[PDB]
Symmetry: C4
Subunit: 196 residues, 4 copies
């Protein structure tokens, strides 16, 4: 039995690897052995894990560009089959389930901040011929990268008033992201300690 679990993990990892390398600038035969093994255990077994196992097989049987792209993307959920053997991924899923309200609050704060600062910078830079934001929707990406401190890149065209708005945006984003993270971190620490 322990040898089979090693075999199953090896097959899952091989499927993940071949899934990545088939996109590089045979594969189907190896994938076929993976899909037979995937469905072979499914019938013997026959929860979220079972649903993921179903999704891991649907794109194979099915095979309008949007539909094909969607099914090709949904094929990536092979990597989530590792949750059966891995423990950290199970812990991460449990914490994500148990911290839904804080995630919603974080998204709401980010949304309020992004619309506020996008309007502010758009109006502050609307009085110049060369505008770095065509519209309020065009500035959501800039605001979300600045508030996350990932960094937009170049702020050269931005004028003096725009620079003041951007400095305020940086400080406010630092604060508003430092706000709702510790609760999620504490939940993860709780679950990890309980598991270990």
């Amino acid at each position: 039995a322990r040898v089979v679990a090693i075999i199953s993990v090896f097959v899952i990892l091989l499927s993940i690897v071949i899934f990545c390398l088939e996109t590089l600038p045979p594969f189907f035969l190896i994938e076929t052995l993976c899909i037979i093994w995937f469905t072979f255990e499914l019938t013997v077994r026959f929860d979220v894990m079972n649903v993921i196992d179903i999704i891991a097989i649907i794109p194979y049987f099915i095979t309008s560009l949007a539909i094909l792209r969607v099914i090709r993307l949904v094929r990536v959920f092979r990597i989530f089959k590792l949750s059966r053997h891995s423990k950290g991924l199970q812990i991460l899923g449990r914490t994500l389930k148990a911290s839904m309200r804080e995630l919603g609050l974080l998204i709401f704060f980010l949304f309020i901040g992004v619309v506020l600062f996008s309007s502010a910078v758009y109006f502050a830079e609307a009085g110049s011929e060369n505008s770095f934001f065509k519209s309020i929707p065009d500035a959501f990406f800039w605001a979300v990268v600045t508030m996350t401190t990932v960094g937009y890149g170049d702020m050269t065209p931005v004028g003096v008033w725009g620079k003041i708005v951007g400095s305020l945006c940086a400080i406010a984003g630092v604060l508003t992201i430092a706000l709702p993270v510790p609760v999620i971190v504490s939940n993860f620490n709780y679950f990890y300690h309980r598991e270990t």
Copy 2:
């Protein structure tokens, strides 16, 4: 009554949406129904929330480019009418009110650091023909993005002494921003726990 609150939230969200999309590269009719509903509840109702409700209607009645731009910008405070229904935004406002001194201290530390490091980098790079900072005021944005770890972008023209100053600036900014944030975070956690 519960249906009306759903209607009110729907109207607020519709106003926010149409406010963003009217800036994209009819709308007035929908906005008119919003402004009638906004003033209709105001008279029936007749605090910070009431003041915000007044500001949400002033730009409509009023309608020198600076004055027009200012009123168009102050029109964005429709989004703060969500504080009546939302709870997280109320919590954020309460924490911002209750942590004024720490915000002032953070701004003071940032101001001292920005002027100090701006003078340092300006003087260190004043001995070269190609200067990356024309004046001490010209370096406030660079210092504030470096100390926030958002990132300025390109430091190539910066010379060896300028690079040493910038490394010191990065380390010092990391420290001086990690200093005053935990108190604000703890205040927010306190208010959020009390509300829930």
Copy 3:
């Protein structure tokens, strides 16, 4: 007496302001009134604060490009005269004095990491004609910005092995900077609580 303290703070702020604006692409007369007031209180008064007061007057009396640049730079210590009236700056100075060993440890860890990763990336990218680091000393700035998460900017010329080294550098820098900061933060919180 309270009016004089307001006057003294006003004079210090005016000196700081005029010091910044004289560098923009009269001033001496206003500065002369500042320097007379600075020396007038010094004689009446006659610690670190007293030493700073001495340094605030030395460049005036003194007035080989390096010496002139050094004295012009050391003139900026007018801003530290605010420590007499401000309390947060005193707290920051006390914490900096009381956390010397941790600052030294942080600098040592940064030094070990920067030399290690600079050698690693230099050797990994030495097998290509187009090298993004001429020498091990040339990579200290890249390593210090990557480990601080400020960001170097463009990593395009960096090859596959260089990219692996850079990913390791990012992760290791995140860890090694998250390591020694909480002690300094706790010291600052202690001093701020004691003062308030």
Copy 4:
């Protein structure tokens, strides 16, 4: 004896310095005195420290480009001989040994996130002629810098769907890196307190 330890630290630092400066765009004679002193103490002494001492001498005696590059790189472990005299480096090594599982969990979470978001952005941007990611492997560096908040640089070619994926990537990376760091930080604080 205390003078010899000063001499030994001076020799180690001199070796580290000359090792860096020999790469700049005599040295062997000084290095020879270092290698004689390194082997002289080794015989008198004759653990991880002893192994490091052996590695510090192997490249000298040995002296196919890959082998030469590998030995030249492995010569850099002179800097780890400072662990005998320094205490912070010993503490860092002890914490790294005592926090292996959390490092593995962090690498696993980063791996899952990087493959997931690389597939997501690659599929979202596969419907345009100008693609910012040739393949799923080509996006690991972008995902790892975005999730670490170091910053990739320019996101201009990235389209609307790609921008939504990138915003999700930034938020998720912030969370998933804030998750497993506090345990390592607490371990380091424990070891540092015990040592002091």
